[PDB]
Design a protein around this ligand. Sequence first.
Ligand SMILES: [Ca+2]
Ligand SMILES: [Ca+2]
Ligand SMILES: [Ca+2]
Ligand SMILES: [Ca+2]
Ligand SMILES: [Ca+2]
Ligand SMILES: [Zn+2]
Ligand SMILES: [Zn+2]
Lengths: 222, 222
Amino acid sequence: GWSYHGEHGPEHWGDLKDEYIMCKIGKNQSPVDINRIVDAKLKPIKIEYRAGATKVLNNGHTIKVSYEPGSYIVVDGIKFELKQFHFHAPSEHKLKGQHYPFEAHFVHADKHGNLAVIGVFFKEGRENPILEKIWKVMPENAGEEVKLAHKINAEDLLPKDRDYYRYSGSLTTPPCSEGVRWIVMEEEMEMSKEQIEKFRKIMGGDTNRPVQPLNARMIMEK
Amino acid sequence: GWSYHGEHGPEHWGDLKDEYIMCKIGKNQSPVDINRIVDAKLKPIKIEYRAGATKVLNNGHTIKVSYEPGSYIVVDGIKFELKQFHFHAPSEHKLKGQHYPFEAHFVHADKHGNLAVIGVFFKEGRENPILEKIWKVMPENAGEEVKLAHKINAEDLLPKDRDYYRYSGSLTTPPCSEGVRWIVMEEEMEMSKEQIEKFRKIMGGDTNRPVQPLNARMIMEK
Ligand SMILES: [Ca+2]
Ligand SMILES: [Ca+2]
Ligand SMILES: [Ca+2]
Ligand SMILES: [Ca+2]
Ligand SMILES: [Ca+2]
Ligand SMILES: [Zn+2]
Ligand SMILES: [Zn+2]
């Protein structure tokens, strides 16, 4: 019964269930304000994506797009399979104290269940032609799920400059499990103001967890 | 008789001499707050530098390091010869409303006198080993100029990531001539807090012109 507003909101997430305890005691939580940055010789990240987005689900907390097996990234010489991507507005991560109006998360998992999430910022700009295909068909109520007519390639929502920030964090929604590899891309993408407004309107407001303390962590920059 | 403080300061520069009129009527002035940015497919910039820094001059307004002929950059298929590089603190340019504590300018000129300046931001970090060589020998008073023992290569003060912001602007000190190509590098370099403090102490304070209106301009990002 968790939410982004009111008494089941982010500050109370850890109180709600035993399984959500990391939202309360965790010291490596996401998102964060990216303001303690260090240059590091990170390897480039192999992105082996095919066209494979199939369904669009409104779950009350976001719009989630599911992906068929076969698409993956390689981080630390390990294959993490793309499972789904979804959205928040405004951005969950901040960059040196500032938000973007929107952020996408591409959620991946290796064979043992370890999670790697690619985060992509979006600013106000040209209509995103890939997001229009999903937005046209966006379910208006929680629980609804539409099948997509044409399969979408998620690689088209990623920038061509693939320099990125890296850090060790968590899921941004309960249970907020830790041990998540975060790959936040430096280069932003574009969306129309209308697309942003539609997403906010349908979600009913802000869909962003507050930034959490960096604590012992640093953010690595390629 | 211009300065960075008081009644001969930046707000009054255009009042001081007829030759300084651009500081008053100019609509394409530098520096600027880099907050209206557009992605653009800018060509990479050829940097053909040799070891060639010879002298270190304190001129009351900065520390200026002079360069022997033979080192150049290529912008718009034109050779601009490196003449000198110098410093300001805090940064002249801002990035999305925020300063860096220090900024370097590498001043170049083509055969007809057209200026191209490469700007490099520096943050607090490790001692810069190339700046230490200059700092050791830094003239304490205006008018003084020391010959360097060992020639320095300016290329070592530039980042290895050479993605850059570009815009059309001006000199940041009187006469503030326009028609200057600005190449401001995206990746920052590092300096020690001690090196910054030494430069500020010797200059006697802030050495940065206030940001000027972007006006009709955009900033291009590679
Ligand atoms: Ca950096
Ligand atoms: Ca880059
Ligand atoms: Ca972009
Ligand atoms: Ca950009
Ligand atoms: Ca750096
Ligand atoms: Zn998310
Ligand atoms: Zn300068």
